[PDB]
Write a protein that binds this ligand. Structure first.
Ligand SMILES: *[C@@H]1O[C@H](CO)[C@@H](O[C@@H]2O[C@H](CO)[C@@H](O[C@@H]3O[C@H](CO[C@H]4O[C@H](CO)[C@@H](O)[C@H](O)[C@@H]4O)[C@@H](O)[C@H](O[C@H]4O[C@H](CO)[C@@H](O)[C@H](O)[C@@H]4O)[C@@H]3O)[C@H](O)[C@H]2NC(C)=O)[C@H](O)[C@H]1NC(C)=O
Ligand SMILES: *[C@@H]1O[C@H](CO)[C@@H](O[C@@H]2O[C@H](CO)[C@@H](O[C@@H]3O[C@H](CO[C@H]4O[C@H](CO)[C@@H](O)[C@H](O)[C@@H]4O)[C@@H](O)[C@H](O[C@H]4O[C@H](CO)[C@@H](O)[C@H](O)[C@@H]4O)[C@@H]3O)[C@H](O)[C@H]2NC(C)=O)[C@H](O)[C@H]1NC(C)=O
Ligand SMILES: *[C@@H]1O[C@H](CO)[C@@H](O[C@@H]2O[C@H](CO)[C@@H](O[C@@H]3O[C@H](CO[C@H]4O[C@H](CO)[C@@H](O)[C@H](O)[C@@H]4O)[C@@H](O)[C@H](O[C@H]4O[C@H](CO)[C@@H](O)[C@H](O)[C@@H]4O)[C@@H]3O)[C@H](O)[C@H]2NC(C)=O)[C@H](O)[C@H]1NC(C)=O
Ligand SMILES: *[C@@H]1O[C@H](CO)[C@@H](O[C@@H]2O[C@H](CO)[C@@H](O)[C@H](O)[C@H]2NC(C)=O)[C@H](O)[C@H]1NC(C)=O
Ligand SMILES: *[C@@H]1O[C@H](CO)[C@@H](O[C@@H]2O[C@H](CO)[C@@H](O)[C@H](O)[C@H]2NC(C)=O)[C@H](O)[C@H]1NC(C)=O
Ligand SMILES: *[C@@H]1O[C@H](CO)[C@@H](O)[C@H](O)[C@H]1NC(C)=O
Ligand SMILES: *[C@@H]1O[C@H](CO)[C@@H](O)[C@H](O)[C@H]1NC(C)=O
Ligand SMILES: *[C@@H]1O[C@H](CO)[C@@H](O)[C@H](O)[C@H]1NC(C)=O
Ligand SMILES: *[C@@H]1O[C@H](CO)[C@@H](O)[C@H](O)[C@H]1NC(C)=O
Ligand SMILES: *[C@@H]1O[C@H](CO)[C@@H](O)[C@H](O)[C@H]1NC(C)=O
Ligand SMILES: *[C@@H]1O[C@H](CO)[C@@H](O)[C@H](O)[C@H]1NC(C)=O
Lengths: 127, 447, 447, 131, 443, 126
């Protein structure tokens, strides 16, 4: 429970996030013994680790690893959202925006992957 | 103009994870003889926060909430584990010679030949068993004793509840794991489903007592607002109706019998406790409830039901006859399992268009909890008379009226499904998974 | 000219790992109460992916395959878990007084004193036991009663199979975990070991039915080409020879007796099912195989063996003497365990150099599976008469290896080791682990 | 997860050149219970999942040690020693397959890993000369 | 001048973690196997790596060491697992009837069960008087009725004859990310800094032996005799003594003790002592006299040094139950109980031959004072004899007195036996991430 | 592998080997016996959790992938008034770690803010 600035404007939410995102970082005698609780706790922890590493892998594929805000080279296409700038970042919440562009996430991911392939080719061409 | 990837975005999705129990360590982990204290050992932090989310509307639904299923499974598993190492009373299921006159019928002076630590030796025993706990082999003849056997011996083995272990409820908190959060709706008039306009995120639920009852919810949490009626589909009369009271009602129940508890050895390191003797007269167990408060509460509930069921006459009545498990207000009172005939309470009529009510109650020892046919437990008696006070905070109502006679609606006590009890406490919560990855356009690019 | 690191390189190595079990997508069934359905709940992928590796050769080896060991252990664990929460027949191991059946000596009419839920009471029971499942204590006298016991009582206890659970071998699919792949050798006429010139990669194997049989493989998959012979070392006479056919020979088996099943209560919620009476005349169980198909199949197998064993006469004589469990064709039909004497099948010799067959079959109720001394199970009978039809797809032969035989080789039926069946079904598969990291030289350097 | 999809395989048929061409085009697209707590099954599934996580993290750490993290193909500063394999450069890529090449230099892997570690360590030393 | 983040810093913090047991590759032959071999299935590296920490001083504390708790729980769990699938002798708790054989032994007879539940078999067995309770007054006119001991307490489990509990040297190894520090300084007492420390992935071979008064195996002290105790002034804290030279002890049970077996249930076998051949003789232990006297003299000198201006008095253990007053141990499954009064009969002065110690035998045991559990040790044919190296002693100072300190054997708590071996070791977790200033900005 | 423990922070050469430092069917009976499998899994998962926490804490500071990384946080006399000559060559890593043990949170916060400033500069620049 650390959903700071949830439901506020996307711009205000991002301005808050620039500071907030950097804030990251005898039961066993009874629990985890003579019952199914050990397996459940291990499953929860392993699932959390799996999701964390999947997110970090997905960031790495786009070349955005090690960043919280990473600008990309993919040009935004208007077909994904008829609203323009300052209407998304003003008078709109993060949840509303995510529900608005839920459908095009796969397309955006494919474009990001192609972009990163081209960036790697440019870097190899730099040598 | 350009895509940009944001991490740490405050976006969540509906999800289902395995919450971990947590409870107050102070004054509960000192001795750890309680089941709920030995389990749920995670100490709760002092003063959990409530990050209020301004201008957020979230779609809640108390029914079809996985938290209720988790709590039900946890309670079942904990009781199973508590009964798991205790003694089995399979050796005691023998022919039971009983005399209806236990000198000076609810209780019978029964005798049997139990086993001992030595296999080729049998201990002759006398024990006072409640008539509900016994079924007959021979049709009874008043002129002499008759042969009986324990109830649910042909069905399954009987596992005595350990005398050292106590099932007294304590306030336990459910807490979400890392990467999840619990949303609490603070509407104060939330009708059980649909959007809620005042939500706040918490790491742990408020204190919940896992109470066991069938008709009247006990020791719960009073609703902030007025009396709230909740039901999945009020048009569907089959579904149970949950009522939260904004004012508690006091119920006091007592076993006025001065029992003496004798113990014998059945096997190696295996004791067995039984009602050795009764001192003084024999009086039924009864419950007292405030009369004026109960009448006012019933009147207000009738008013609310009439509001939800306009153009009708609201009638409260006793439940239709049947099994004792479903037609009586059952509960646990200091290890004794009561069963109360609440006909005297649900007798009033519709809301118009000092003194206390005495309720008779029966007590059993051999319990078949949660309708789990194939399992049973024997609750040993306790020396001295028993008293216990409780706060009635809710009612479980079932709407009848298939005939649709006149313009009269009939409500009866519900029960039989324990999930309703915990849904009455977990209605306001919802588990959500954070999805920190997010995308939005902006003006700056890689360059 | 300079080192370079690649990720995602297509390189793999042999490895051993746990494999998931997955059933058909929805399995056309709900609440099947089947062991294979209760486990293997993961639904397989409809339209499974398969990819062909062009110009790739891999050294398969069906022997020394860990998948066989994993499947063997999984099958044993499944059976143990299924039998564990079922009725124990320790009470029934008592002195049985059996006499000749009151017909108007395979079966005997046995009477005994079984226990009841009440310890002091004992129940007189009459039941029909097959003579195989009983061992005498007194030699027969005058045709009257004599003492008997259940077999295997002196060795270990007996666990009745739960009647509600069924062991129908529905197909299952072994799916490899993440990071691993299963290589399937597409090349027909693959002789068990050595390279394979056409391979493909699959998440899960094809649907495999875990059938239990000794002499004849049943309901298996058919060979693509002609008959295939496989053996670890054909020169060695000890190693079993797996004959895998390209055509199916139908076999029909049936128990003609009309059983009357009567049950009793031995303990608390402990039932026991037995054959109370047989309606009509008593007849021996039998199996039937179409004579023409069997003769053609044996002739083709003899031809193939002659090709592998030139300048010798192939015999196919009867099994060597021994116990019933190893010298006969055992299998399961609706929980009834058959034991068929296949001596009338393996009778004809084939000479390269120079109308159905009826088979008597015995029935047993007390079983020892996988030769595990110290465990047993009691398969309950079924009312009415049983019929079942199966496809004989493979044979298990043991070469006699007669020293200095007169230009003759004798191939008796094999069996006794259940791993051979699943090795016959899992002959084409191999598990490999991907090693995506790799290094190679190129011209562009770090700079 | 890491590079685990079967789409990485299938290129094993072609030579090293074609497989390399397939990478940087299909690499990133491919990168993208009832009896639970009833039997050891649960422990076995947890063991398998934890082993998969450990293998993935070890490979990522090893890439990071060489300074190649975040790249499918990274050019290093280590010169190629002819003693490991004197095969022609064109022969290595145009002909042969990643399986054959792996079999050829299986025994020299540790030496190349140590050389890569030394090279990246020297690069870090050079980066210390900021001023 | 500027902050700088270093990774891989050599710094550690005191920590607690679940160590895993490791043993030699040829731990035991797989035919009969051993509980310590079936467990500890991790081959150990021969000649374990030892990185001596130059000029490093570290704090140790043999008491308040979690390794002792982990070993204690591991031993308890291993024994429970080993005895879990064995035979239950609950059927045998019946009214026994016993007579004289021709004092310790009694010719007991009883009606045991059979594989058939409607049949019984007469059994004659020789039971030790210690394991048999006088159900009647024991008038012994001709015979008398008894029962098995602890039957009213808890069920009795037979130790599986196929499995052996003989100790073997087992090594404890830390998991990934942790390390074990071994204090190599001679004559270092616990609860103090140690200057000679070294890092090892695994401990040396530790023999999990069970005894109450004398440590019958283990590692001798490097230098001289060493005294260790948590307080050494509070009389409740047990004192542990490490000997720098071993003392031979040979123990035996001079009886034939023919073994017979019967079936008490389906697949259930029970073994008993049947009859005997030759005379009835008591078990005893021969311990070398000169070595014992010299060792006690040296220990008396050391205690006098730690307790100046007093007379070091060694006294037999105070009266009490056999489980707490005798030197207990386990030779080939037989549980001995020796008086050992003669060994502690000497007073130290502040200003060829052997000692024979009589010993009793018990078959029914209650190990580690776990009331509510018990086990039955089956007998073995032939006369048993075993040899061991007494490496240490466990002494309890009585703590008023006329210039005299009374030292008695005791310390029945089993944690002390393993603390006497694990005192050298401490488990630590490495914290590789570290920060320090330097002379360079990031730019 | 506490190489050069108590070397007076003379690990200018020792830490350069940290790069090389970073690189039974019978036993499987225990995993399906008792609770030793649970304990082993807990140890594995705890080790993975600590490693990932350290890696994330390196990533947040922007020092990802570096054995040694300089930062933009200036050293303050409040933490320690010992010159670099005394810290390097006299004080050991253990002693140094004890010296600034209580100031760790402040240094972490300053590192986080410095890296956030670096990201803001990069974003607004490009
Ligand atoms: C709703 O909440 C009310 C309380 O507000 C409950 O009523 C109480 O119920 C409890 C449990 O039955 C009662 O506690 C019992 O008291 C017995 C008498 O002891 C008294 O004196 C001791 C002195 O130390 C006090 O600690 C104790 O509270 C009493 O005042 C005890 O003999 C009982 O012991 C049982 O529980 C313990 C727990 O550790 C076990 O160890 C024992 O073996 C045994 O099982 C018990 O402590 C209390 O007296 C009742 N008070 C009232 C208000 O009457 C309702 O029952 C509850 N209803 C629900 C669940 O809805
Ligand atoms: C190789 O493969 C063949 C074909 O699958 C197997 O032979 C079959 O074996 C199965 C059992 O595993 C047989 O199935 C049984 O058929 C009985 C007869 O069918 C009647 O009943 C059904 C409804 O149940 C009607 O639809 C139908 O018209 C008939 O009236 C059923 O009575 C059996 O059901 C019994 O068990 C179920 C629980 O599982 C109970 O609910 C039922 O009440 C009842 O007790 C069952 O469905 C099948 O008939 C066989 N077919 C053939 C070809 O003979 C071989 O066994 C297999 N290889 C080997 C050797 O195992
Ligand atoms: C402190 O440490 C010492 C040394 O380990 C212990 O004393 C030892 O106790 C064991 C007990 O078994 C003694 O071993 C016995 O030796 C007998 C003679 O050995 C011959 O026969 C065996 C095979 O039986 C051959 O392997 C050997 O080479 C000789 O040919 C054997 O007859 C005994 O075997 C019987 O018991 C064992 C028990 O494991 C069974 O496995 C066998 O099958 C058989 O039934 C046995 O091997 C050993 O000799 C003693 N050593 C010393 C020093 O004398 C102490 O017991 C220990 N501390 C205490 C007191 O507990
Ligand atoms: C064990 O050694 C420690 C020192 O490491 C002792 O502690 C102190 O030791 C000094 C002598 O070096 C004494 O003067 C102090 O009186 C001791 N104080 C304490 C804590 O008692 C400790 O006493 C020693 N204990 C034993 C039993 O030898
Ligand atoms: C061992 O033998 C010794 C020596 O006899 C016993 O010690 C005697 O105990 C009694 C108890 O009442 C005392 O009265 C005697 O004074 C003690 N010594 C003598 C001289 O007999 C001891 O009881 C026996 N116990 C053990 C454990 O062996
Ligand atoms: C409760 O309110 C919601 C608001 O959406 C409505 O959909 C639902 O039908 C109401 N149910 C009751 C109990 O009246
Ligand atoms: C509570 O819910 C009702 C539903 O009609 C809504 O009108 C009201 O504004 C809500 N108030 C709060 C506190 O969210
Ligand atoms: C509620 O029950 C009535 C019964 O007639 C039914 O018609 C209606 O569709 C149900 N609606 C819901 C919310 O399930
Ligand atoms: C290649 O490796 C050999 C191995 O000893 C070494 O002697 C030689 O110097 C190396 N040459 C190059 C160019 O790396
Ligand atoms: C035990 O038996 C062996 C058999 O050789 C004998 O040599 C030895 O002296 C006997 N010892 C005792 C004390 O019985
Ligand atoms: C000290 O030991 C001597 C040994 O002979 C004994 O006589 C004396 O009574 C003992 N005194 C005390 C107080 O222990």
């Amino acid at each position: 429970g650390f959903l700071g600035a949830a439901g506020s404007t996307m711009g205000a939410a991002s301005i808050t996030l620039t500071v907030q995102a950097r804030q990251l970082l005898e039961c066993q005698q009874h629990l985890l013994q003579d019952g199914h609780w050990g397996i459940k706790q291990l499953q929860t922890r392993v699932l959390a680790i799996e999701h964390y590493l999947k997110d970090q892998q997905l960031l790495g594929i786009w070349g955005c690893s090690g960043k919280l805000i990473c600008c990309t080279a993919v040009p935004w296409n208007s077909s994904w959202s008829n609203k323009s700038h300052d209407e998304i970042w003003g008078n709109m919440t993060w949840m509303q925006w995510d529900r608005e562009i839920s459908n095009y996430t796969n397309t955006i991911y494919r474009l990001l992957e192609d972009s990163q392939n081209q960036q790697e080719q440019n870097e190899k061409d730099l040598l | 103009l350009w895509v940009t990837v944001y991490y740490g975005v405050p976006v969540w999705k509906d999800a289902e994870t395995t919450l971990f129990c947590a409870s107050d360590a102070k004054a509960y982990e000192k001795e750890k003889r309680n089941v709920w204290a030995t389990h749920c050992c995670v100490p709760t932090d002092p003063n959990p926060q409530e990050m209020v989310l301004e201008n957020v509307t979230e779609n809640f639904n108390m029914w079809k909430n996985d938290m209720v299923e988790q709590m039900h499974e946890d309670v079942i598993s904990l009781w199973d584990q508590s009964l798991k190492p205790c003694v089995k009373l399979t050796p005691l299921c023998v022919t039971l010679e009983c005399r209806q006159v236990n000198t000076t019928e609810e209780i019978k002076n029964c005798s049997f030949n139990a086993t001992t630590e030595l296999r080729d030796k049998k201990q002759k025993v006398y024990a006072l068993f409640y008539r509900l706990d016994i079924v007959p082999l021979e049709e009874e003849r008043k002129g002499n004793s008759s042969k009986y056997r324990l109830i649910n011996c042909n069905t399954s083995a009987i596992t005595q509840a350990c005398p050292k272990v106590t099932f007294d409820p304590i306030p336990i908190h459910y807490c979400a794991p890392a990467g999840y959060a619990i949303l609490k709706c603070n509407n104060k008039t939330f009708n059980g489903t649909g959007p809620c306009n005042n939500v706040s995120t918490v790491q742990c639920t408020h204190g919940i007592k896992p109470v066991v009852s069938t008709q009247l919810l006990l020791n719960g949490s009073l609703a902030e607002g007025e009396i709230i009626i909740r039901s999945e589909n009020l048009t569907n009369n089959v579904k149970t109706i949950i009522v939260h009271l904004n004012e508690s009602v006091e119920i006091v129940c007592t076993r006025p019998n001065n029992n003496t508890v004798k113990s014998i050895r059945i096997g190696p390191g295996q004791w067995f406790y039984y009602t050795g003797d009764i001192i003084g007269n024999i009086r039924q167990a009864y419950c007292n409830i405030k009369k004026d408060d109960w009448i006012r509460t019933l009147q207000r509930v009738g008013k609310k039901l009439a509001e939800h069921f306009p153009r009708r006459i609201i009638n409260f009545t006793q439940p239709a006859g049947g099994d004792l498990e479903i037609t009586t207000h059952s509960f646990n009172c200091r290890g004794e399992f009561f069963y109360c005939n609440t006909s005297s309470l649900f007798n009033s009529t519709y809301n118009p268009n000092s003194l206390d009510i005495t309720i008779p109650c029966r007590i059993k020892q051999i319990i078949n909890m949660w309708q789990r046919v194939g399992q049973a437990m024997y609750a040993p008696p306790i020396e001295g008379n028993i008293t216990c006070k409780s706060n009635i905070t809710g009612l479980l109502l079932v709407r009848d009226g298939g005939v649709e006679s006149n313009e009269t609606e009939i409500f009866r006590p519900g029960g039989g499904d324990m999930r309703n009890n915990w849904r009455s406490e977990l209605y306001k919560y919802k588990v959500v998974e954070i999805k920190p990855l997010g995308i939005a356009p902006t003006r700056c690019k890689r360059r």
